[PDB]
Amino acid sequence: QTQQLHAAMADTFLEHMCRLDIDSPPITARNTGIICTIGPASRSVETLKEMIKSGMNVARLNFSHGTHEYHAETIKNVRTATESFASDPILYRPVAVALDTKGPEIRTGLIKGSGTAEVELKKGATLKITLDNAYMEKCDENILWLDYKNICKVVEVGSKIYVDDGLISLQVKQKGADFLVTEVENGGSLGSKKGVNLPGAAVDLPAVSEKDIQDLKFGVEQDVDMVFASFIRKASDVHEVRKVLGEKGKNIKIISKIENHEGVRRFDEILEASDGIMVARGDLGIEIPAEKVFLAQKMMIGRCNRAGKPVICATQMLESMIKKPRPTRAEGSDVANAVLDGADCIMLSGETAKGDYPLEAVRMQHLIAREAEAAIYHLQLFEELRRLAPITSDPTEATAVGAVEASFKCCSGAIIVLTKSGRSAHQVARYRPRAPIIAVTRNPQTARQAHLYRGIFPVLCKDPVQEAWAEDVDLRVNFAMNVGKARGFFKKGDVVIVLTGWRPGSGFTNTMRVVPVP
Amino acid sequence: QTQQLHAAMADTFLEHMCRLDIDSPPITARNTGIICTIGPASRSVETLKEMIKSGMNVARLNFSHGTHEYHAETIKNVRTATESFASDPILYRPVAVALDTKGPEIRTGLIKGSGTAEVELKKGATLKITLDNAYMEKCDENILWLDYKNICKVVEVGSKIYVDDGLISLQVKQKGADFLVTEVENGGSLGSKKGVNLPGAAVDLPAVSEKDIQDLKFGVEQDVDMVFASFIRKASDVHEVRKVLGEKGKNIKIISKIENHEGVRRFDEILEASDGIMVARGDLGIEIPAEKVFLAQKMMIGRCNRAGKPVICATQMLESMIKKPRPTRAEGSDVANAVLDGADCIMLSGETAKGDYPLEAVRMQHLIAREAEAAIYHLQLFEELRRLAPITSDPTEATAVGAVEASFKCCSGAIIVLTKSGRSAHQVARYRPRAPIIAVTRNPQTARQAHLYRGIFPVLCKDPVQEAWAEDVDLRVNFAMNVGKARGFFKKGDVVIVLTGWRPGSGFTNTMRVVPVP
Amino acid sequence: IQTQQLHAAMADTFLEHMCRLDIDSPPITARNTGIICTIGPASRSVETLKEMIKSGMNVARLNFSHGTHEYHAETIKNVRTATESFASDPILYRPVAVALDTKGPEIRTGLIKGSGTAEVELKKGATLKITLDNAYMEKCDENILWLDYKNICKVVEVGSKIYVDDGLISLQVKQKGADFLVTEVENGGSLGSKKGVNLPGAAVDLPAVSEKDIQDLKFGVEQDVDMVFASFIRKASDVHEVRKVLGEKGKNIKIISKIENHEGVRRFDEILEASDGIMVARGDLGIEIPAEKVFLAQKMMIGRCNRAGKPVICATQMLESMIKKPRPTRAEGSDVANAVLDGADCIMLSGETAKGDYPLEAVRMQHLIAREAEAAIYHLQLFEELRRLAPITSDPTEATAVGAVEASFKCCSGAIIVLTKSGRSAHQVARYRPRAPIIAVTRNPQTARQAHLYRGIFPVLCKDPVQEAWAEDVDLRVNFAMNVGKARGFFKKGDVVIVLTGWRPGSGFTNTMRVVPVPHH
Ligand SMILES: O=P(O)(O)OC[C@H]1O[C@](O)(COP(=O)(O)O)[C@@H](O)[C@@H]1O
Ligand SMILES: O=P(O)(O)OC[C@H]1O[C@](O)(COP(=O)(O)O)[C@@H](O)[C@@H]1O
Ligand SMILES: O=P(O)(O)OC[C@H]1O[C@](O)(COP(=O)(O)O)[C@@H](O)[C@@H]1O
Ligand SMILES: [Mg+2]
Ligand SMILES: [Mg+2]
Ligand SMILES: [Mg+2]
Ligand SMILES: [Mg+2]
């Protein structure tokens, strides 16, 4: 038996688990998109071809560091690598580009002289915090400076303050107008220009930094497909970013990054305003107890699945592959679970940008995602989504459910959807069929953006439009049939689902057909 | 709110019940077919028009009694009444004809002298059963004769014996090779040529009687649409009936009537060989304890639903309306529960054939079935059917499920299916949508036979094919659109599901579209 | 080859459950659904009542529609005589309860011109004037019809239907004065005298209890009935009225509200809350609302009663044909099964036992079907569903009951034995609907009788004096139930059973569940 089918039949979740089989090989398609952060270790065209081949679907650009000219080159290279395969449209896999903003931060000043010197903080000692600028350059173990002018307004006696990536931990014992008197809870080495998190606080830093405003305008100019907006806390934040990309970039998918408590508390309003979500586990698990992170991940992927909006699963998934060519069992497990949890993307940071093994990381993510995709309990997952599906008399939605049910009934090798905007394909994906969704689009941006949705395989028709709209439709169907055939998703005989519309232009998708592969 | 929708939403069966609402009116469509036995009280053309109008869909002819000339006239009249409405194909309802065989029997002899005289059986008296032929003509209250040579082999001391349609009740007190000595439990008037059931005993009479052979040949000649084959006990039996209708009548649906223990015990093999099933509660509740009947009914409707084959629910459903113009609460309840149980047909016997109130019986069945159809727990019913659906790579099946899912998603006003053989419509019905299935067919037999399946509204296109196959398809779709409109199943604006094929001829139905009503 | 429909109880889907019901899977010997028989001409004799009890009667209904105090007093005397005839052996003694069903408020017409036996003929489409003016009481023709409901005008609009003689005749109001109505005949028929009137869809403002009712109820107090079926309950204030009337001296009598019209259904919630139980009065009900809609109301009501853990009764015409015939119609058989499957506590017999030719055959038939249907329930889901809709509470008694019921499912327990003073503990077990019979052991006779009102409680009345050590007194009552169960054939030595006790004497301390093998005692 194959593709974990015996397990997909089980009546109980428990029997489902009990029946997972290591000798049941997956289908060839892989549904979870893979996002790789590009950096020193992966910027070369020659390398990027190898990434795409290994399964990269999105390129992340981390505006934490690096200048415009530097990033512009990364993008130019990603593009070069991608179009290298454009010469055969059957096999060409689009690659999307993503601009991840630095976001607002709270940084400390320099330690006494050189930014290279450190001071030693003792569990229990007093540590005064000034905002007075005199102290910017000379930070010792008695006085520490911040660039968050308004820290006093947003903290109470008793609040924790986390310094250098939540290594050092302070607690506020007294609050003036200008200063704070803290006690060290967690000792350690204090350095220069280190980053500060205010756990629990409603931090009032603007939605976008001045750097961000400019970094974003650049992304518009460079024509990125999506932005990962950092440190989204409230929906007004998302609205800021939207305003900033403004008209010229009104089609760029804004993906809100949930990095602290306020973000979690206000996730609902946020999700509403966002195109998607990234569960930013790194920053998040500095702001909230680490043991609580899986809760937040599961809550978020859950609600994103309910709302049919893309969710990303980020940070440290294959961390050890920065140094080693194979991952830890926990890393293997982390990735499987994100997939089973029902995440759209999975992401690689260090592992691809700086690590010794970028390719090994991508292939590993590819391998696990496939195995985990077969291991889903679609029986229940489908039943559940269907039961929570709002009543709508929108034909597109009705067609999608019909299609997805049909695909379950006939172990369909794929659901083929003609889509101009991607909307139709999204509607199919939101129901999470086991079968890959081949989305056939003439719109390249649609092709790239589609990766953000579990199971959509974007496929870009480069032919001119044919005279009769009928034959043009048939042509695009036939294209997908060829793509599917060639990529080994199905052979002559197998059955497939095809979704078409009744008239040209967007949102007329309403025709579902069950077709045997020619 | 309408159509018991608030109740259809409930997460539990219990909440579902708790939420059934007497102020939530049904839609106008009624899905459960209604089978009326035609007889003295209903044979007139003038009456039959009124039956059709009231909701009769099949005419049952009981070959228990009546000659060929008699039945031939019933059929002539049914036909006359039906075609009376043929002048407007939008409103014309097809009517099927069904031949219900007499089947093998065990009969008694004549009472002392004229077969017009009777005897009295006294609770507690002795009643000898002979097979000795001396007694054939002279049966008194001391000695009773049977024509079933093999009774003694198949009955033990303690067995019950039912005489005259389980009116009189005997228990065997001593058993020889040649005779039985019984005690009367239920007193009553013993007549001539009265029928006998040996409850629990496995009666070995041949599958088809001599009369049956001939009655069946007649049904072939008369062009009936289905046969209700009596006293089906094993699959061999069904095979006999099929052989007898043979080639000339290979298209007539055989519906096996389960009338005794062996029939229930062997239901599986039977169902497999049959086109459908009738739960013959009268006979059945003479052969098995009456308190056990609802078990058998529920088991059989259940397994017929599982197999997607039509089940009928017969006998005494509105019994009191033989004498009275309104039914008892228990009768009302019986009918609702048949529908809730998931029966295709419901049936009337006495109530339409002999009763004082044939029309009131039909209208009553119509009224209840509608209310009960809304009261079904489709959420679970659908979930269950889907989970127990074989995985199949037949396109038609995949299209049907998709169509039914779609219809649930959009509160579809109807699922419109173009079908030549009826197969496609059956496949949609087997999934039990809330929405009516309008089947559009040019084949009149298909039209009539369709009534045997929950929710199919057969609609007969009498026009020739013209011009392009496409526009012929559109034409038939449009016909159904008009039928639906006129019968008040939906208005302009409402959304409907339409099933077509990709090519002419049977099979190939594989196109589902979600269309707003013009 | 299996028993008690076990293979079917295992099924993962409702559909598979149905598909697996088996006519060769015989039930256990216990029967859980209580059976209520109306006593009348055909069943009032002591000699007959012994045979009824034997056959499975658990409650005796008295219909105050008809019959005088002296008459009913005698029926009760006899029921009691028949019952205590078996009191000589407490192991085999079955308690029988007594129930007073009130006549309730009515709307009656006057006498047809001259003899109260003579009739008029009403033609579809004719005009029919309705007066309340008393001049017309004695002389009712086909043009003018009198009612005794002085307030009809206030409670009906132009367009309202009026149903005369048990919804045989049907009028629609065309004009409404201060004093009169002008109606049109929709349903023709023969109009008689003193015939009953229903106002479908009206909020009928007749008092909750009639003057007759007040008195009939006071009688029930005096006669020491266990429950009252209050007729024509419409709003909760109605139930409060009945309670007020039974008042203090009768504060322990269970009031069971009878739902017989629209307002009753519309307001069922408030009503159920104020009632001890409910009767689905299908006859009257299906005159007030379209008959085709009644199964909706029945199913809604039994449903919500199950949710609330309050007793529900299913009434009227369940085995109607057995007034004249010794066996029922397939639809009657089916009706009874479905009431049980629907999850009704009691089933009822009216005509069938009171006036019919075959009272005993009706009782035995109800007994037979209920047993079969009880095995046919889908306990898996029924239990899952009740548990999921159970509020979280910190009440030990509830925790013990669920535990008990789950344990009984686990071990195919032959019975759940509960020592109960008020019945409350047994009710709490029953509200979860175990397959196993609940033997409730009580020294309180009223508790014994009232217990019948709940699916699956088998009341068993300990007549012994209290034993010195409270422990051994507890053991004694457990042992009693063990003996009863043995003798009634509910289990044998070896079988396993669940026993519920408390930690201290007096009510509401039940918190001990044990799993005990049946002894060689
Ligand atoms: O994916 P979207 O934006 O909903 O648009 C889907 C549209 O694509 C089609 O299937 C074909 O696209 P064209 O308009 O480019 O012919 C339409 O028939 C349909 O309405
Ligand atoms: O040959 P026709 O009458 O045009 O048939 C066309 C339609 O009938 C179908 O054959 C229906 O299938 P069935 O007859 O098997 O039910 C389809 O291929 C198509 O939708
Ligand atoms: O010895 P007693 O007072 O009869 O009570 C025996 C046990 O049954 C209970 O009375 C339960 O009775 P209730 O159902 O009336 O609460 C316990 O509280 C007690 O332990
Ligand atoms: Mg960050
Ligand atoms: Mg027969
Ligand atoms: Mg199963
Ligand atoms: Mg009444």
B63 annotated ligand binder = yes
- Distance in angstroms (rounded) separating the CA atoms of residues C500 and C404: 8
Q: What is the largest CA-CA distance in chain A?
A: 80
- Distance in angstroms (rounded) separating the CA atoms of residues A134 and A121: 22
Mutate to test the pocket of ligand 3, among C398, C400, C419 (most ligand atoms within 8 A of CB): C419
C356 annotated ligand binder = no
DSSP state of A195: B
Contact check, Cβ <8 Å, B395/A495: yes
Nearest atom within ligand 2 for CA of residue B473: 4
- Three-state SS at A7: helix
**Cβ-based contacts of B401 with chain A (< 8 Å):** 405-406, 409
Resolution in A: 2.9
Helices of type H across A354-463: 358-375, 378-388, 395-409, 423-429, 444-449
Give the strand pairing for C189-191 and C120-122: antiparallel
The H-or-E segment that residue A35 falls in is strand A33-37
Protein residue with least CA distance to atom 7, ligand 3: C502
- Distance in angstroms (rounded) separating the CA atoms of residues C384 and A394: 36
- Distance in angstroms (rounded) separating the CA atoms of residues B407 and B432: 11
Is the shortest distance between the CB of A421 and ligand 1 below 6 Å?
yes
- Residue A418 CA to ligand 2 center (angstroms) comes to 26
- Distance in angstroms (rounded) separating the CA atoms of residues B237 and A103: 81
- Distance in angstroms (rounded) separating the CA atoms of residues A101 and A104: 9
CB B500 within 8 A of CB B473: yes
Q: What count of other Cβ atoms lies within 10 Å of the Cβ of residue C47? A: 9
**Residue B257 designated active-site:** yes
CB B515 within 8 A of CB B495: yes
Q: What count of other Cβ atoms lies within 10 Å of the Cβ of residue A248? A: 11
**Cβ-based contacts of C20 with chain B (< 8 Å):** 299, 302
Look up residue B320 and give its amino acid. Answer: S
Taking the CA of residue B336 as centre, how many other CA atoms within 13 Å lie in the half-sphere pointing to its CB? 27
- Distance in angstroms (rounded) separating the CA atoms of residues A28 and B194: 71
Mutate to test the pocket of ligand 3, among C444, C500, C507 (most ligand atoms within 8 A of CB): C507
- Give Cβ neighbours of residue C125 (< 8 Å, ≥ 6 apart): C184, C185
CB C58 within 8 A of CB C27: no
Structure tokens at B233: 């006990």
Query: Which residue among A389, A406, A516 places its CB closest to the CB of B402?
Result: A406
- Residue B328 CA to ligand 5 center (angstroms) comes to 26
CB A483 within 8 A of CB A456: no
**Cβ-based contacts of B306 with chain C (< 8 Å):** 15, 19
Residue of B nearest to A386 (CA): B409
C423 annotated ligand binder = yes
Is the shortest distance between the CB of A500 and ligand 1 below 6 Å?
yes
CB C442 within 8 A of CB C423: yes
Give the strand pairing for C127-131 and C180-187: antiparallel
- Distance in angstroms (rounded) separating the CA atoms of residues B207 and B243: 11
The H-or-E segment that residue A460 falls in is strand A456-460
Phi/psi at A512 (nearest 5 deg)? Answer: -115, 125
Mutate to test the pocket of ligand 3, among C425, C444, C472 (most ligand atoms within 8 A of CB): C425
Nearest atom within ligand 3 for CA of residue C421: 15
Of B497, B511, B513, B482, which Cα lies nearest the Cα of B415? Answer: B497
Of B37, B315, B352, B446, the active-site residue reads B315
Per-position DSSP letters for A96-164, written without gaps between them: EEEEE------BB--BSSSTT--EEE-TT-EEEEE--GGGSS-B-SSEEEBS-TTGGGG--TT-EEEET
How many interchain CB pairs under 8 A, A with B? Answer: 107
Give the strand pairing for C254-259 and C277-281: parallel
The H-or-E segment that residue B383 falls in is helix B378-387
Structure tokens at B317: 């459903």
Q: What is the CA C226 to chain-centroid distance, rounded?
A: 13
Of B339, B331, B336, which Cα lies nearest the Cα of B357? Answer: B331
CB B34 within 8 A of CB B363: no
DSSP state of A320: G
- Distance in angstroms (rounded) separating the CA atoms of residues A267 and A304: 10
**Cβ-based contacts of C327 with chain B (< 8 Å):** 166, 186, 290
* Phi/psi-derived region of residue B165, left when phi > 0, alpha when psi is between -120 and 50, beta in every other case: left
Structure tokens at B358: 């044939």
Helices of type H across C275-395: 282-288, 294-308, 330-342, 351-354, 359-376, 379-388
3-state secondary structure C352-383: HHHCCCCHHHHHHHHHHHHHHHHHHCCHHHHH
CB A129 within 8 A of CB A180: yes
Q: What is the largest CA-CA distance in chain B?
A: 79
- Residue C449 CA to ligand 5 center (angstroms) comes to 46
Of B144, B139, B192, which Cα lies nearest the Cα of B170? Answer: B144
Enumerate the β-bridge partners of residue A58.
Answer: A35, A96
Q: What count of other Cβ atoms lies within 10 Å of the Cβ of residue C103? A: 15
- Three-state SS at A265: helix
CB A323 within 8 A of CB A360: no
- Distance in angstroms (rounded) separating the CA atoms of residues B30 and C98: 45
- Three-state SS at C102: coil
- Distance in angstroms (rounded) separating the CA atoms of residues C242 and C260: 16
Q: What is the largest CA-CA distance in chain C?
A: 80
Mutate to test the pocket of ligand 1, among A396, A424, A513 (most ligand atoms within 8 A of CB): A424
- Of chain A, the end-to-end C-alpha distance in Å amounts to 25
Q: How far is CA A67 from CA A102, B447, C252, in A?
A: 12, 75, 86
Contact check, Cβ <8 Å, A513/B502: yes
Query: Which residue among B368, B381, B387 places its CB closest to the CB of C292?
Result: B368
CB B493 within 8 A of CB B517: yes
CB C61 within 8 A of CB C37: yes
User: What is the strand order of the sheet C438-442 is part of?
Assistant: C457-461, C438-442, C416-419, C496-502, C510-517
Is the shortest distance between the CB of A509 and ligand 1 below 6 Å?
yes
CB C126 within 8 A of CB C185: yes
Q: What count of other Cβ atoms lies within 10 Å of the Cβ of residue B243? A: 11
Instruction: Pick the ligand that lies closest to the CA of residue B421.
Output: 2
3-state secondary structure B257-313: EECCHHHHHCHHHHHHHCCEEEEEHHHHHHHCCHHHHHHHHHHHHHHHHHHCCCEEE
- Residue B234 CA to ligand 7 center (angstroms) comes to 50
- Three-state SS at B130: strand
Of B221, B295, B294, B289, which Cα lies nearest the Cα of B252? Answer: B221
Of A316, A239, A283, A314, which Cα lies nearest the Cα of A106? Answer: A283
Of A437, A443, A444, A394, which Cα lies nearest the Cα of A420? Answer: A443
Contact check, Cβ <8 Å, B302/C21: yes
CB B396 within 8 A of CB B507: yes
Structure-token match 């601009």, residue found = A99
Residue A122 CB-density burial (10 A; 0-12 exposed, 13-18 middle, 19+ buried)? exposed
Contact check, Cβ <8 Å, B410/A389: no
Neighbouring residues of the ion ligand 5, judged by CB less than 5 Å: B 283
The H-or-E segment that residue C480 falls in is helix C470-487
- Distance in angstroms (rounded) separating the CA atoms of residues A323 and A356: 6
Rounded to 5°, angle at Cα C321 from C316 and C325:
145
The H-or-E segment that residue C172 falls in is strand C169-176
B142 annotated ligand binder = no
How many interchain CB pairs under 8 A, B with C? Answer: 201
- Distance in angstroms (rounded) separating the CA atoms of residues B338 and B319: 15
- Distance in angstroms (rounded) separating the CA atoms of residues A438 and A415: 6
Q: What count of other Cβ atoms lies within 10 Å of the Cβ of residue A371? A: 19
Structure-token match 């013009």, residue found = B518
Query: Which residue among B387, B392, B411 places its CB closest to the CB of A379?
Result: B387
Query: Which residue among C19, C289, C304 places its CB closest to the CB of B302?
Result: C19
Contact check, Cβ <8 Å, A513/B515: no
| Chain A nearest C-alpha distance from B13 (Å) | 14
CA dihedral (B289, B292, B298, B299) positive or negative? negative
Q: How far is CA A126 from CA A100, A154, B485, in A?
A: 37, 21, 83
Instruction: Pick the ligand that lies closest to the CA of residue A379.
Output: 6
- Distance in angstroms (rounded) separating the CA atoms of residues C197 and C132: 14
User: What is the strand order of the sheet A96-100 is part of?
Assistant: A311-314, A276-280, A253-258, A226-232, A96-100, A58-62, A33-37, A345-348
Helices (H) and strands (E) in chain A, counts: 18, 21
Give the strand pairing for C346-349 and C312-315: parallel
- Distance in angstroms (rounded) separating the CA atoms of residues A226 and A256: 11
Give the strand pairing for A126-130 and A179-186: antiparallel
CB B333 within 8 A of CB B368: no
Instruction: Pick the ligand that lies closest to the CA of residue A64.
Output: 4
Q: How far is CA B455 from CA B422, B437, C297, in A?
A: 13, 6, 24
Give the strand pairing for B495-501 and C277-281: unpaired
Structure tokens at B28: 């106008």
**Cβ-based contacts of B406 with chain A (< 8 Å):** 398-399, 401-402, 512
The H-or-E segment that residue B6 falls in is helix B5-8
Contact check, Cβ <8 Å, B375/C335: no
- Three-state SS at C14: helix
| Chain C nearest C-alpha distance from B262 (Å) | 11
Method: X-ray
- Distance in angstroms (rounded) separating the CA atoms of residues A90 and A106: 48
C355 annotated ligand binder = no
- Distance in angstroms (rounded) separating the CA atoms of residues C77 and C96: 13
Per-position DSSP letters for B457-498, written without gaps between them: EEEE--SPP-S-HHHHHHHHHHHHHHHHHHHTS--TT-EEEE
Is the shortest distance between the CB of C507 and ligand 3 below 6 Å?
yes
Instruction: Pick the ligand that lies closest to the CA of residue A280.
Output: 4
- Distance in angstroms (rounded) separating the CA atoms of residues C206 and C103: 13
Q: State the angle between helix axes of A395-409 and B395-409 in degrees (0 to 180), rounded to the nearest 10.
A: 140
CB C470 within 8 A of CB C505: yes
- Distance in angstroms (rounded) separating the CA atoms of residues B275 and B255: 6
**Cβ-based contacts of B497 with chain A (< 8 Å):** 398, 402
Residue C437 CB-density burial (10 A; 0-12 exposed, 13-18 middle, 19+ buried)? buried
Q: State the angle between helix axes of A293-307 and A329-341 in degrees (0 to 180), rounded to the nearest 10.
A: 30
CA dihedral (A88, A92, A95, A96) positive or negative? positive
Of A30, A60, A175, A281, the active-site residue reads A60
Enumerate the β-bridge partners of residue A100.
Answer: A62, A228
- Distance in angstroms (rounded) separating the CA atoms of residues B32 and B311: 11
- Give Cβ neighbours of residue B83 (< 8 Å, ≥ 6 apart): none
3-state secondary structure C107-169: CEECCECCCCCCCEEECCCCEEEEECCHHHCCCECCCEEEECCCCHHHHCCCCCEEEECCCCE
Residue of C nearest to B372 (CA): C296
- Of chain C, the end-to-end C-alpha distance in Å amounts to 31
| Chain A nearest C-alpha distance from B486 (Å) | 22
Query: Which residue among A387, A391, A409 places its CB closest to the CB of B398?
Result: A409
- Residue C16 CA to ligand 6 center (angstroms) comes to 8
**Residue A60 designated active-site:** yes
Q: What count of other Cβ atoms lies within 10 Å of the Cβ of residue B70? A: 11
Look up residue C144 and give its amino acid. Answer: I
CB B279 within 8 A of CB B312: yes
